[PDB]
């Protein structure tokens, strides 16, 4: 806990505002107050007189819609000296330094004599306020010119917290009183005196706009405007009582910003409604109670950490919207009422103001989730979570923050369609003041109801909504708006539910003799799409059925139909970005492939079923030693193969799945390594013999394995199942593991590092391989989108020629990090969301100084305990002590299965490791500069190929895309199994052998999967090479060069590059075509 406290202090001091700028702004606004006193008074005026008064002036009154017309503006207007005061965070001295800048909230209380007791009706008070602001702006402008300060101030109107009913004047400074360096902007809030209007008449249930429906938003604006200093006084008391108030306030402010939470209005569509004020007020409420029994939840003696934790826990656990709400008294212990108002409510009985009116139900739910997630991070003891909680911005990219985003282009957008505008009507104008608020709810209710359980959270954002306008104009003018609507287009952002996102049928109310109300709304909502259907269990229910597709999720079809039916028939809903990602996944050549969803693993299961059939045959055969167990370890057994298994598609590199066959322990195993391996083959010979005789439908052949260095006697039995699947069997013996250790011990001290590498590859294939597939398969069921994203990630690597050096397991371990460690984000629920999160991680991963250690466990045992966590950290520090630059090892990936951390990430050349990070950084930078679209996604999956020294073009004699099981085809295995090689790509073996020969001079890369990344025919592949710095320049001639060189002087040689192409070409034979150097 001490580490957390010291980190908290370091954060506070880092963001602490410099006190010099406080004097500068205080030096100005103190003089500004004198100007406000200079402004003269004004007489009673009707709308006709004030309109003429302002007719020729540059200033324009910012009248709030509905603007006062001559008939209903019978009341008169007047101006008098206000009671100037300073409010907000600056008043409480709880502000922090913000590079984007902060704001100083100056309050001008309109004198009470300007108001009548019934001025809170029909915008009467708002229109009086508007002219009061306009008259001030007029006189403030001329006085500003008088004192020569106009040169460096810019004055414009703006809406308070994006509230259309509360325009305000914003003073900003451009490049003695010049406060540009301070990064502050003074806001002139024109509030009312306290208790001018009976607060009971302004309750949320009451109405104040005659047309009766309630007006919660309108009631809040007038009432909150009349209660500003009172809440300052309330927070002022709490600041004195508890010594840790300001420190907790900045922590919440920092926490809120990173999640993209602000105090602005949310009914418009932006995420917000909860800001520093609301967080501070809630904390103040909790310091005076908060429990159901009115007992204090927070104590004045709590520290900054404890005060923050309590507020986070209260939000996480207590529901304030549907079932329950909290009441407190500013001027009386706060009590949690179990009854709920169906909207966020933090009631203040003293002031009759609900502080959470600006928060929508949708935004509140996301708040509760974020609060809940951090509470889990805040209780975590094994891992430090300070940086995730406070020092990571998750609001930068919508796509990383939201699983799916749909942008809806509304019709006729210099005003919305008459039919669309007609839907607004007058009743909703009373309930929802602006059409933007009305449209936001309209999209929210239908989208929420339509998708139902398919989603967890929904956000409706009005893209391109402005909140500040010039003094010459009365309302904000949008280019598409024409002063009609303040937004470019609306974007629907969803957090999908992977378990039920791809359900084929949307269940509804059950059938009844008399059609229930729930049944009515379902049939009315869906119309022709609705149906009554019966299932195997015998239930009769109203349900509508959709069609799955491999290119888009079901949710894309639901939102399109629902929005068009209810919002407008001319709306255009589009999410092409998700479609591109889905298409980048290879399409298998199976029946109904296009109609299959990306979450369907039927192809993998079919391979498993064919394995289980072969599993029974092997066990029942009689051998000298009983079969202990047969463990499948192939990629397709953990749902990670890039292209799904396809029967008889034997050109695919991952066709032959590895299987570990282990016999019972015996003391007759040979004690010498080659004898042991030849003994293992003798068992595979017998399995093939009895398999060939008893089960002739199976075909089998033998192939050599050279993956383990210096163990050249490994022979694997390949079984070709009648179903069309291939399996590679290798025998594991208990004596084998100890024989390698013997070789290390008996090896000379100089050779020991080489032998331990041989052991490292053995354990990666035989011992560690079993554990990796077991955990990854079991976990993948809870993370539905893990299988598609890792496949697409392996597609991304291959296009950039990295899979040749990045082993399969290492890619999976990197690709699973966003799922097992989703903090500060959520678990991926989209193929687009998951892939980008992997790229985001690699971009910001400082593998030289930060290890990657994972808890391969299902969502909240096998969790890494503190002892195990520290031990793996110690392994990293010891390794980096000997390898500070990271030349030998770059990526440190560790977990329960691999505590060493070097098992799956050894042998990667440093050029490749930096390339992986370099590509990830450019991918993120490309996304920032240009938003996610069709063009950018194509740039992601196209390789540069220009950085490499020389580039080689190959073509296979025959296209392999069809034989790889990819739909843009063999239906049986060849009669002679030698014909299999005729339909294989050897370029993967080409680069591997050349790398060994030119390890000391060159680094060669190629595309492993030619069917997927080889054009339409899947026959084109490329070898790209790199010349190390040493041998690019000339070198003195010596025996130990180990490089192919040509003489220039008696003792100088240079890389005989022209010879090297011949050796590459001679190796390629017909396949090679062209060279670029």
């Amino acid at each position: 806990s001490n580490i957390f406290k010291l980190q908290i202090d370091e954060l506070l001091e880092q963001v602490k505002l410099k006190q010099k700028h406080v004097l500068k702004v205080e030096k100005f606004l103190h003089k500004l107050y004198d100007i406000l006193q200079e402004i003269p008074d004004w007489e009673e005026k009707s709308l006709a007189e004030v309109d003429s008064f302002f007719k020729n002036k540059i200033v324009s009154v910012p009248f709030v819609d509905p603007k006062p017309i001559p008939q209903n503006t019978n009341y008169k207007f007047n101006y008098k000296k206000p009671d100037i005061s300073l409010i907000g965070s600056f008043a409480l001295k709880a502000g922090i330094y913000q590079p984007n800048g902060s704001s100083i909230d100056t309050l001008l209380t309109m004198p009470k004599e300007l108001f009548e007791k019934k001025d809170f009706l029909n915008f009467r008070c708002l229109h009086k306020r508007s002219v009061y602001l306009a008259y001030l702006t007029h006189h403030l402008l001329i006085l500003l010119k008088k004192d020569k300060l106009d040169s460096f101030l810019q004055l414009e109107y703006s809406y308070f917290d994006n509230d259309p009913l509360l325009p305000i004047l914003r003073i900003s400074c451009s490049k003695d009183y010049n406060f540009y360096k301070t990064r502050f902007s003074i806001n002139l809030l024109i509030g009312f005196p306290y208790k001018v209007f009976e607060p009971k008449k302004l309750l949320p249930n009451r109405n104040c706009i005659r047309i009766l429906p309630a007006t919660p938003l309108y009631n809040f604006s007038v009432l909150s405007s009349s209660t500003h200093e009172n809440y300052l006084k309330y927070l002022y008391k709490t600041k004195k009582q508890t010594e840790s108030f300001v420190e907790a306030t900045v922590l919440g402010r920092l926490w809120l910003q990173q999640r993209g939470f602000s105090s602005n209005m949310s009914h418009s569509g932006s995420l917000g409604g909860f800001g520093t004020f609301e967080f501070t007020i809630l904390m103040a409420a909790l310091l005076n109670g908060g429990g159901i029994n009115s007992n204090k939840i927070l104590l004045h003696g709590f520290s900054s950490y404890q005060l923050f934790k309590g507020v986070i826990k209260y939000l996480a656990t207590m529901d304030l919207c549907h079932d329950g709400h909290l009441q407190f008294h500013s001027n009386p212990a706060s009590k949690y009422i179990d009854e709920g108002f169906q909207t966020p409510t933090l009631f203040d009985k003293s002031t009759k103001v609900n502080i959470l009116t600006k928060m929508t139900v949708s935004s509140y739910q996301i708040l509760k989730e974020y609060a809940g997630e951090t509470l889990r991070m805040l209780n975590n003891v094994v891992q430090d979570q300070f940086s995730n909680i406070f020092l990571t911005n998750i609001s930068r990219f919508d796509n990383l923050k939201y699983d799916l985003c749909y942008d809806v282009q509304l019709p006729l957008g210099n005003n919305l369609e008459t039919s669309l505008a007609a839907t607004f009507g007058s009743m909703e104008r009373v309930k929802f003041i602006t059409l933007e608020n009305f449209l936001a709810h309209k999209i929210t209710n239908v989208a929420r109801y339509a998708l139902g359980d398919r989603i967890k959270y929904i956000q409706i954002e009005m893209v391109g909504q402005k909140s500040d306008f010039p003094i010459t104009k009365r309302k904000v003018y949008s280019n598409t708006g024409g002063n009609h609507f303040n937004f470019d287009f609306v974007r629907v952002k969803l957090i999908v539910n992977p378990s039920e996102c791809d359900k084929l049928v949307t269940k509804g109310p059950a059938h009844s003799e008399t059609m229930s109300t729930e049944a009515a709304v379902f049939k009315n909502f869906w119309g022709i799409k609705s149906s009554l259907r019966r299932f195997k269990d015998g239930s009769i229910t109203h349900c509508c059925v959709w069609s799955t597709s491999s290119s888009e999720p079901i949710i894309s079809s639901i939102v399109n139909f629902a929005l068009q039916k209810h919002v407008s028939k001319k709306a255009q809903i589009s999410n092409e970005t998700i479609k591109k990602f889905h298409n980048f996944l290879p399409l298998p050549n199976l029946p109904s492939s296009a109609k299959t969803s990306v979450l369907n693993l039927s192809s993998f299961f079919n391979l498993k079923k064919s394995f289980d059939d072969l599993y029974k045959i092997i066990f029942q055969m009689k051998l000298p030693l009983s079969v202990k167990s047969i463990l499948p370890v192939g990629s397709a057994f953990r749902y990670t193969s890039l292209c799904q298994p396809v029967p008889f598609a034997y050109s695919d590199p991952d066709f032959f799945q590895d299987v570990i066959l282990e016999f019972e322990t015996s003391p007759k195993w040979p004690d010498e390594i080659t004898s042991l391996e030849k003994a293992k083959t003798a068992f595979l010979l017998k399995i093939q013999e009895e398999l060939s005789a008893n089960s002739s439908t199976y075909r089998s052949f033998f192939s050599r394995d050279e993956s383990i260095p210096y163990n050249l006697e490994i022979v694997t039995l390949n079984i070709l199942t009648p179903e069309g699947y291939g399996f590679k069997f290798r025998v594991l013996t208990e004596r084998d593991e100890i024989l390698y250790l013997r070789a290390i011990a008996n090896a000379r001290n100089e050779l020991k590092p080489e032998l331990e590498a041989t052991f490292l590859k053995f354990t990666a294939k035989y011992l560690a391989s079993v554990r990796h597939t077991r955990t990854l398969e079991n976990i993948s069921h809870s993370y539905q989108f893990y299988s598609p994203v890792v496949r697409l990630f392996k597609r991304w690597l291959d296009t950039h020629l990295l899979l040749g050096h990045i082993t399969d397991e290492l890619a999976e371990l990197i690709a699973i990090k966003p799922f097992v460690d989703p903090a500060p984000y959520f678990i991926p629920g989209s193929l687009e969301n998951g892939f980008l999160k992997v790229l985001k991680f690699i971009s910001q991963w400082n593998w030289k100084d930060d290890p990657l250690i994972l808890d391969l466990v299902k969502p909240e045992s096998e969790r890494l305990t503190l002892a195990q966590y520290k031990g793996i950290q110690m392994n990293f520090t010891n390794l980096r002590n000997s390898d500070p630059n990271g030349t030998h090892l770059q990526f440190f990936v560790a977990s329960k299965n691999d505590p060493s951390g070097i098992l799956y990430s050894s042998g990667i050349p440093l050029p490749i490791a930096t390339r992986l990070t370099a590509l990830a950084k450019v991918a993120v930078n490309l996304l920032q500069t240009h938003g996610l679209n069709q063009q950018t996604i194509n740039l992601l999956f196209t390789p540069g190929l220009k950085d490499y020294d020389f580039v080689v073009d190959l073509r296979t004699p025959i296209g392999l895309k069809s034989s790889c099981g990819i739909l843009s085809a063999p239906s049986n295995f060849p009669e002679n199994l030698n014909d299999l090689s005729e339909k294989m790509d050897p370029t993967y073996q080409l680069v591997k052998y050349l790398n060994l020969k030119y390890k000391n001079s060159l680094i060669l890369s190629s595309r492993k999967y030619i069917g997927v990344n080889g054009g339409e025919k899947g026959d084109k592949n490329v070898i790209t090479g790199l010349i190390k710095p040493l041998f690019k320049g000339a070198h003195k001639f010596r025996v130990n060069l180990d490089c192919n060189v040509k003489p220039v002087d008696d003792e100088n040689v240079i890389l005989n590059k022209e010879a090297i192409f011949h050796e590459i070409a001679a190796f390629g034979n017909d396949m090679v075509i062209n060279f670029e150097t």
Binding site: H800, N846, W847, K848, N885, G886, Q890, L910, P911, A913, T914, R915, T917, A918, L919, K921, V922, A923, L926, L939, L940, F941, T942, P943, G944, L945, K946, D947, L1026, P1029
Partner: peptide, 13 residues
């Protein structure tokens, strides 16, 4: 195209 000059001193980190 997605191009990054190869870094052989690990300077990109």
């Amino acid at each position: 195209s997605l191009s990054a000059g190869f870094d052989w001193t690990a300077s990109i980190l």
